[PDB]
């Protein structure tokens, strides 16, 4: 359709990866599913990175006030701007995008006590759109998910 087949597939993949990762983070009940190698590998690496983020930035994150989806979006965008200020993209940094998505969603759950399904869907969506818009071309140029990402983290 609007983006053409390749770009649409790319966007769908990134969305799928993001919602799968965030559901894993949150411990949303899975259904004897069989993640792709990319999903499994992303889940393993992004989860360990998220814990490193949470440990290393604890003093900052303890002072975050993620009371709504809109606040999460604002914080996400401002942090991403500061992170990618230097224009460098690599797989390590892409993983931190998913991981920080997870950090914000955990804080949102903490403030709301319980999320509804709409919350994780919306966060996964703005995360995925960021990744596609800012790093989708880089991802394509660097082997995509099956050839780049998997070969980087699970050779």
């Amino acid at each position: 359709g609007p983006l053409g087949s390749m770009a649409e597939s790319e966007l769908m993949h990134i969305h799928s990866l993001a919602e799968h990762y965030l559901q894993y983070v949150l411990q949303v009940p899975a259904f004897e599913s069989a993640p792709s190698q990319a999903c499994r590998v992303l889940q393993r690496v992004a989860f360990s990175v998220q814990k490193e983020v949470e440990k290393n930035l604890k003093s900052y994150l303890d002072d975050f006030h993620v009371e709504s989806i809109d606040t999460a979006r604002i914080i996400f965008n401002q942090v991403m701007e500061k992170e990618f200020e230097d224009g460098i993209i690599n797989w390590g940094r892409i993983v931190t995008i998913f991981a920080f998505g997870g950090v914000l969603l955990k804080k949102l759950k903490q403030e709301q006590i319980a999320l509804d399904v709409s919350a994780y869907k919306q966060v996964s969506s703005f995360v995925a759109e960021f990744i596609m818009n800012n790093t989708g071309e880089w991802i394509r140029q660097n082997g995509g998910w099956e050839d780049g990402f998997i070969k980087k983290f699970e050779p």
């Binding site: 983020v53 900052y60 914080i75 401002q78 390590g92 940094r93 892409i94 980087k152």
Partner: peptide, 24 residues
């Protein structure tokens, strides 16, 4: 001077680059 979200983003970049080097 710096800002909290500045510091947060710059620390994410550090971790990302460190991970990129870790799996190399």
């Amino acid at each position: 001077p710096n800002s909290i979200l500045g510091q947060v983003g710059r620390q994410l970049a550090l971790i990302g680059d460190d991970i990129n080097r870790r799996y190399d």
